[PDB]
């Protein structure tokens, strides 16, 4: 009974990597209160989700086929191949044809319960969408391939079954907190404590303490009194205790003043605080350190029969005209970039004229940053403002903006909630583009249960794909983030309890696999020095240990975390080789458990341990965004954002791109380089000089995409050790752990392929200057969306600290200039790489000296 639940919770705890029943690290029931809250939205979505479509999770889009995918048209005819057993029959189809409409034309060209499954994958060509609007199809086209499909039985919705779940204002006293003392084990200095009252990163009030000698224990007993009445404390307000050294910041911890029940905080607390190895998302956490045996502590008293916060209640339609030169200043402000700080006057002006600012949704981020949140009366005037959301509600979703209201500068439930309301109108296609961000954006939420959380949860349970990646993006944080694992765990359990028995069995297999393969790598790296190269007594112990796990542990087949349609199966021991890198990665390879697989190409995975893979993920998920932004302007820069998921602490997986070789291995075929080796290698891997020319094309595109991209994200200056290229001309970076500086890697060996030397030009290189600016300006259009993604990436991924760090992308997009001053700028930079050729490429080699 409650024994088939303690084996289930035993199941769920394993899948998660955190025991959501553990209270060994909390001073209230917010995490639990939240486990309980989320039951409804789960159950609503499980309740409402359609069984057939959920099982087939058709991956479609409601976008317009780009100009370029039309030029592969073939006179309004797309050919689709079907296979029942050994059979197969091409079939002309219209792009606007549906799936149903196509079994109709097929049954009569050659008992209604057959769905077109894709050959080799668990991807389904079903439902009421033009087949031109399926992503699997738009893919085969982009890549010039052959839409293979096998007619067979619709998968059973009974497998997606789910187990039924068993389960005032007006106190004028200035607010005080008594700092009793600090206590730490192994600590000769001087040290005080700083008590900030925070709200979305701004300090409402701050009162420090008397410095004192740095011993293992330090008392004070002070009553600390702040300037701020207890009526003006805003819901979400943080009491933030920090501890400085003499000067430098060394410890922090945080406590919500208003709890989840709206009650204020009364009482005695002993808070375990986080140590520091400037803005960072771990500085905002309400979580306390769980390593109570080593971490600094702190004790404090909240005197405060209990005082509680009232949920505002809706209640001035008078209108006056606005001078010209004021509305000039308003509209000027509202136009500026997110990263533009507001002067106190810009603020008084924005707030003063708040009803005219409400008309431009683009002024919402700047305006809700103009609120004295330390002022009970202001704050309400604000609630009454968000009640007049006629224009917001009607506004076309703008994601740059929505995001902005979910970053660290906004900590007010009502604001954030309107951003989320806008997220609702996103088709699942777009949710996947931004899911990682909108999972990271949960770090800036003040309370565990939030509307953002309930949105990730709805959307994830409604579509299986999103589901899958929601699992791994969450499991990735829970495992390497002590500041947020407890919050994310409550959420992931929430999702798991509604995804179906079908996917539990699947995540159970992916995790076990990853669980073993973690093991092998560790064992294997502990035999080779960060110095040592690759031993053959090692190559014997690898194929020893895989031969082993293959001959027992690894299940017949598991789904591929970075690409879940694909089922991998049996190991290709022969191909599996530890790689040369100092951090000793595992080049792996599997056959595809799917009998209907067209090719024999294997599934190629690179288990790495030694570094945090979450920084690769963020960078990639942005490039995938840049592409979709090059699709809305009919542009395709052939990027290769390889799959790369993080699975646990400092270890994850990467996708191996078939038949691709670095630049460096191309050159070393005493650090010199030669130009012709580019082409020589291309022509050698182009059977015909026809395919050779297709290849030189990718190279112009790909090379150009990756130079714009890399320039923007400030990661252009790489070493050819870290650039690669497929046999078919496609160029792309790897390893994102990122004297004379180069804006990006455009070394003379590329130019050569473009057919140029020293200071010349050619039919390709003029093209390449052509495409680049098309691609650059295209981004400049979406400046705001990119700044806010960049900013949020630093704060939730690159321990980022500096506000000047972001003032970068500002300049790199060169804001507030016309499409000319820019196109120059860029093409100026294209040139700087010419005036430098290899000098820097050479230095990444000579570096091994300094
Ligand atoms: O680290 C990180 N993240 C990180 C996060 C946080 N903080 C630090 C680092 N992420 C990462 C690192 C490396 C790779 C990668 N992905 C490959 N793919 C095979 C083809 O589909 C694409 C992937 C290959 C193929 N080869 N490699 C290298 C092996 C080691 N290398 C050499 O031994 C070497 C040296 C000199 C000249 N040639 C080779 C250099 C070449 C690859 N590395 C991928 C991801």
Swiss-Prot record:
Tissue: Pancreas, skeletal muscle, liver and heart.
Region (G-loop), start-end ranges: 578-584
Residue ranges annotated for the C2 PI3K-type domain, each copy included: 171-303
Subcellular location: Cytoplasm; Cell membrane
Domain of life: Eukaryota
Pfam families to which the protein is assigned, alphabetical: PI3_PI4_kinase, PI3K_C2, PI3K_rbd, PI3Ka, PIK3CG_ABD
UniProt-listed CDD domains: C2_PI3K_class_I_gamma, PI3Ka_I, PI3Kc_IB_gamma
Keyword Cytoplasm among UniProt keywords: yes
Impact when changing residue 718 to P: Abolishes protein and lipid kinase activity. Does not abolish interaction with GRK2
InterPro entries: ARM-type_fold (IPR016024), C2_domain_sf (IPR035892), Kinase-like_dom_sf (IPR011009), PI3/4_kinase_cat_dom (IPR000403), PI3/4_kinase_cat_sf (IPR036940), PI3/4_kinase_CS (IPR018936), PI3K-type_C2_dom (IPR002420), PI3K_ABD (IPR003113)
Residue ranges constituting the PI3K-RBD domain according to the UniProt record: 75-153
Keywords: Angiogenesis, ATP-binding, Cell membrane, Chemotaxis, Cytoplasm, Disease variant, Endocytosis, Immunity, Inflammatory response, Kinase, Lipid metabolism, Membrane, Nucleotide-binding, Phosphoprotein, Serine/threonine-protein kinase, Transferase
Gene Ontology terms for molecular function: 1-phosphatidylinositol-3-kinase activity; 1-phosphatidylinositol-4,5-bisphosphate 3-kinase activity; 1-phosphatidylinositol-4-phosphate 3-kinase activity; ATP binding; ephrin receptor binding; identical protein binding; protein kinase activity; protein serine kinase activity
Protein's name according to its UniProt entry: Phosphatidylinositol 4,5-bisphosphate 3-kinase catalytic subunit gamma isoform
Regulation of activity: Activated by both the alpha and the beta-gamma G proteins following stimulation of G protein-coupled receptors (GPCRs). Activation by GPCRs is assisted by the regulatory subunits (PIK3R5 or PIK3R6) leading to the translocation from the cytosol to the plasma membrane and to kinase activation. Inhibited by AS-604850 and AS-605240.
